[PDB]
């Protein structure tokens, strides 16, 4: 039987990978980091409260100008916020109200969203007509589209619930690159700062590092015990952190190809919806199901602070590109800005 | 106050956007959200044409009441990752064929379509997001089941069934077996209706169940539930 021989070879390869990871690990991040000063207590106050959504807010994204926001809720409305003045720049009515992701273009020209309609809809913000119209609708996913991220005005990577990540060409609307290999539904997505690689967290308790220009998985990261719902690169692009339903955040390194540190507490038992990093990467912000965001010392696994003030589950997180503020969205139809 | 002309005009635009958002929310608050569920293509389509590829939107108005019925068919993924989106629906319309008690699902060996429907109903009814959400269970294809129960007994489906091979007793037994999967009888209600291929009063049953759910909701507001 060739199938049993190939299963034995796959088991041998997995054991070789595990042995190479074990032999390459000598001193953990705790053992080197325990000799530096902690960050103390990180206290943040709600500076703005963005009201106007009427259903559970499922996603958000910050602008690269660190002032403009976009948020998605089950109203069927994509509201673009001026976070400095608490002003609604745009309100985009959606064809499908079951939106679970939204992205904002780095140029600021476009907004994507997607959800249970299996379609990433690109919206042209800066039109000659003065309204926000659909640029195009990207179809081809057979499952719910769980995350989308703009590379530029013409390239976008969309995570989806068909156990498949996909890279699209917005000029043609065609499936440029298909990323396959995940067993469970892919729930999160995060682009590298140079947009050369990206990581995806799925429901197979695994994270995979893909290359955009070759379209095939480089490394696979395991260690979680439940469905990964959040993922985010470290700011230099050489590491990333995940968040799953087992109330643990794990930090993984691309070069070491290992898990470095678990950010978990005994008093936290609920799942993690959103994971975001600060500008320096020293603080890891994670949104949980117990209605608040916990700031973690990303180098020391210490609870640096708690961002409490949401009446329902914190579903989405976002730190501005200048690191000035963190914005938490939640199921109680509110967005809050913190400093 | 300490605002420019463009700042004041942007604030005015934001207030107009807030006004349109409030009107849209008030329009959507009077609509009835229904989640349509069932094990495969069993009776969803006949029910849909009786009132009227990701999620399917079905819009119909009955007695000056607009209904939003969502079909999550062909969403072949983990249900728990998107079933919390329908936490605030008015009721769940669960469609079950009565004639597939002896048919096989053909996806798994020795798998019954009826038992797959029981397992899906057990997962949906006792879900954490549907603790207080009522279920309008529809038992599809009663005439086909009635004419085929003479040829094939129900004991091949339920080994512990010892009643007569009649339509009424076995149909009541199937309804009781589906209602026994509700472990939250103190906080939710299951409405069961038997529907034929061409049955006209299906909408009225949905309207009555939705009206009971709406009465249960209004009473909370009055602080009397």
């Amino acid at each position, epitope marked *: 039987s060739e199938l049993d021989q190939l299963r034995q070879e796959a088991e041998q390869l997995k054991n070789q990978i595990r042995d190479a990871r074990k032999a390459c690990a000598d001193a953990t991040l705790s053992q080197i980091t325990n000799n530096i000063d902690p960050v103390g207590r990180i206290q943040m106050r709600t500076r703005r409260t963005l009201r106007g959504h009427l259903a559970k807010i499922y996603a958000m994204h910050w602008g690269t100008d660190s*002032r*403009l926001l976009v948020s998605a809720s089950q109203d069927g409305k994509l509201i673009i916020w*001026d976070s400095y*003045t608490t*002003n609604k*720049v*745009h309100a985009i009515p959606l064809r499908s109200s079951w939106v679970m992701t939204c992205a904002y273009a780095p140029s*600021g020209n476009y907004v994507a969203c997607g959800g249970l309609d299996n379609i990433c809809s690109i919206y042209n913000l800066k039109t*000659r*007509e*003065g*309204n926000v119209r659909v640029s195009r609708e990207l179809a081809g996913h057979t499952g719910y589209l769980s995350c989308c991220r703009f590379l530029d005005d013409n390239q976008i990577v969309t995570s989806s619930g068909d156990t498949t990540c996909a890279l699209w060409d917005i000029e043609t609307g065609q499936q440029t690159t298909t990323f396959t290999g995940h067993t469970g539904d892919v729930m999160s997505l995060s682009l590298a700062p140079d947009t050369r690689l990206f990581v995806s967290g799925a429901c197979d308790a695994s994270a995979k590092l893909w290359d955009v220009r070759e379209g095939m998985c480089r490394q696979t990261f395991t260690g979680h015990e439940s469905d990964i719902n959040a993922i985010c690169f470290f700011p230099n692009g050489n590491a990333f952190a995940t968040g799953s339903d087992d109330a643990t955040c794990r930090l993984f390194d691309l070069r070491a190809d290992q898990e470095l540190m678990t950010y978990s507490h005994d008093n936290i038992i609920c799942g993690i919806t959103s994971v975001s990093f600060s500008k320096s990467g020293r603080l890891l912000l994670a949104g949980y199901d117990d209605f608040n965001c916990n700031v973690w010392d990303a180098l020391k696994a210490d609870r640096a602070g708690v961002l409490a003030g949401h009446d329902n589950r914190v579903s989405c997180l976002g730190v501005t590109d200048d690191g000035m503020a963190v914005a938490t969205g939640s199921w109680d139809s509110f967005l809050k800005i913190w400093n | 106050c*300490t605002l*420019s*002309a*463009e*700042d*004041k*005009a*942007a604030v*005015e*635009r934001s207030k*107009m956007i807030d006004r349109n958002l409030r009107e849209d929310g008030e329009k959507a608050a009077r609509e009835v959200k229904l989640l349509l569920l069932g094990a495969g293509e069993s009776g969803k389509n006949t029910i849909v044409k009786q009132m009227k590829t990701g999620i399917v939107e079905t819009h119909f108005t009955f007695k000056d009441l607009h209904f939003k019925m969502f079909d999550v068919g062909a969403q072949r993924s983990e249900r728990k990752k998107w079933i919390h989106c329908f936490e605030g629906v008015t009721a769940i319309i669960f469609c079950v064929a009565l004639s597939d008690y002896d048919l096989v699902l053909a996806e798994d060996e020795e798998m019954n379509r009826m038992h797959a429907s029981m397992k899906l109903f057990d997962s949906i009814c006792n879900n954490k997001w549907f603790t207080d959400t009522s279920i309008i269970l529809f038992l599809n294809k009663k005439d086909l089941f009635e004419e085929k129960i003479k040829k094939s007994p129900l004991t091949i489906c339920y080994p512990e069934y010892a009643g007569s091979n009649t339509y009424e007793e076995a149909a009541a037994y199937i309804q009781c077996q589906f209602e026994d999967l509700n472990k939250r009888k103190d906080t939710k209600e299951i409405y069961t209706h038997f529907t034929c291929s061409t049955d006209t009063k299906n909408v009225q049953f949905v309207f009555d169940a939705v009206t009971d759910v709406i009465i249960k909701n209004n009473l909370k507001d009055c602080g009397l539930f």
Partner: single-chain antibody, 234 residues
Framework: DVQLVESGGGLVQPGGSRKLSCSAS????????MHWVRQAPEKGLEWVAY????????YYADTVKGRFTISRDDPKNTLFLQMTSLRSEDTAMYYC??????????????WGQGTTLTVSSGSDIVMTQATSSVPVTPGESVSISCRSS???????????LYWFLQRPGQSPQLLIY???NLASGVPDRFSGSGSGTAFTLTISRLEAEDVGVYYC?????????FGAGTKLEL
């Protein structure tokens, strides 16, 4: 395409009443605030009236306030300027101007072709252009300077300075909308700069396509005041 067509102009006896219409097509007329800007035969842009989106805010120039009436009907995309008691100084070519206001918006971006109406026979921000007409060689850089009595820099960091170019026999178009921001469809050879009350507009590699009268307008506070107009010749 975005188009604004004016109508209703003509010869009017003094003290008469005429109504101007501005039919809008090719854009969402309801979401745009709308301005009336007239230009006398002496070649000077003058702001007249403004109506916001939803008709919630209406402003008038001090010379037409209580005597002109601006209104819009969003169902049919028409802007109205009901004028009563017309005197000889109202003889001007009235432009219907399109302007939207949000963060990063470009107001005064589209101007209509204008309708010509003929009448027979203190605290404002003064906008100053030192040069009224200068000759320029094509292919060479030119600078148009503008000054303001009040500082146009606001507390929010925006300097509300607008640059308009009006070619001969054409409606004015927007080039720079907040003292540095290049407009849509205008070449990158137009650049604006300045600080406080001193302003400049640089046109590197000038062509015959740039020949016209250049106006500086402030949008810090109503009424909106234009410059005298710097004309480029040769």
């Amino acid at each position: 395409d975005v188009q604004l067509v004016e109508s209703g102009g003509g010869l009017v006896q003094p003290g008469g009443s005429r109504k101007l219409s501005c039919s809008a097509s090719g854009f969402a007329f309801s979401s745009f605030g709308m301005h009336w800007v007239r230009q006398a035969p002496e070649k000077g842009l003058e702001w007249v009236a403004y109506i916001s989106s939803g008709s919630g805010t209406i402003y008038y120039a001090d010379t037409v306030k209580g005597r002109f009436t601006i209104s819009r009907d969003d169902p049919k995309n028409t802007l109205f300027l009901q004028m009563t008691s017309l005197r000889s100084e109202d003889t001007a070519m009235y432009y219907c101007v399109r302007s939207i206001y949000y963060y990063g918006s470009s107001p005064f971006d589209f101007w209509g072709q204008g309708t010509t109406l003929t009448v027979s026979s203190g605290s404002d921000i003064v906008m100053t252009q030192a040069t009224s007409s200068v000759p320029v060689t094509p292919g060479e850089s030119v600078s148009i300077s503008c000054r303001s009595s009040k500082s146009l820099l606001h507390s929010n960091g925006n300097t509300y300075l607008y640059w308009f170019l009006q070619r001969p026999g054409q409606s004015p178009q927007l080039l720079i909308y907040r003292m540095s921001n290049l407009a849509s469809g205008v070449p990158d050879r137009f650049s604006g700069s300045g600080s406080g009350t001193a302003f400049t507009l640089t046109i590197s590699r000038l062509e015959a396509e740039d020949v016209g009268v250049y106006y500086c307008m402030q949008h810090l506070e109503y009424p909106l005041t234009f410059g005298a107009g710097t004309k480029l010749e040769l």
